[PDB]
């Protein structure tokens, strides 16, 4: 009774920022004549079998540095690499363990959902919006490029109040004065560097 292959540990779920090299580790004992492969769990396509990488994906590699551990390696990690990967032993039936990769992604500003340069007549309201994406979800701050204070609603009231900056995707300017013209900068960050900014130029005329 020299027994069947068995998984020794488990593949821990991992988190990497984009651009790094993701490594998943799979440990098996008593492999014998059987084979260890990796598959992408989404589409069941074979990434590797034994020491051969079967996919044509140039970013995928496998390692086997000691006798009980098999590693899958994904270089230049992308959002599309997110998800679960399966270590499989070709027993009958197959034995499988699953490990999943959470890819942290630095923020993007979705330009086509965000404000372009605009002009308004003095007195109009204008909302400046930066819709940002990323993982974790970014936060957005607004400030004037020239460092001058921004006029926003005084909370609960109908009056306005000066602030150094505003935290939120939509900067809501009310009854604009001509001196509120100029460049507004929205900065999106989620602590996965770099942050990202969009410059929005506001013109205020007579109207
Ligand atoms: C390991 O991760 C899978 C995948 O879930 C994703 O990755 C996690 C690390 C985390 O970021 C989740 O928010 C992601 O959805 C886990 O399976 C998921 O479990 C949740 C809650 O039980 C469920 O809503 C999802 O549908 C599951 N997704 C899949 C693809 O199965 C799994 O539970 C994690 N394992 C351990 C031991 O923590």
Residue numbers in the entry: 35 to 241
Quoted from the paper:
We have recently identified interactions between two groups of Drosophila IgSF (immunoglobulin superfamily) cell adhesion molecules with properties closely matching a neuronal chemoaffinity function: 21 Dpr proteins, named after the founding member Defective proboscis extension response, selectively bind nine proteins, now called the Dpr-interacting proteins, or DIPs. All 21 Dprs and nine DIPs are predicted to contain two and three immunoglobulin (IG) domains, respectively. Our previous work identified the first IG domains, termed IG1, as the domains mediating the Dpr–DIP interaction by the formation of a pseudo-symmetric IG1-IG1 heterocomplex using the GFCC’C’ face of the immunoglobulin fold. Therefore, Dprs and DIPs are strong candidates for a synapse specification or targeting function.
In all structures, the two IG domains are in an extended conformation. The extended conformation is due to lack of linker sequences between the two IG domains in DIPs, which also holds true at the predicted DIP IG2-IG3 and the Dpr IG1-IG2 boundaries.
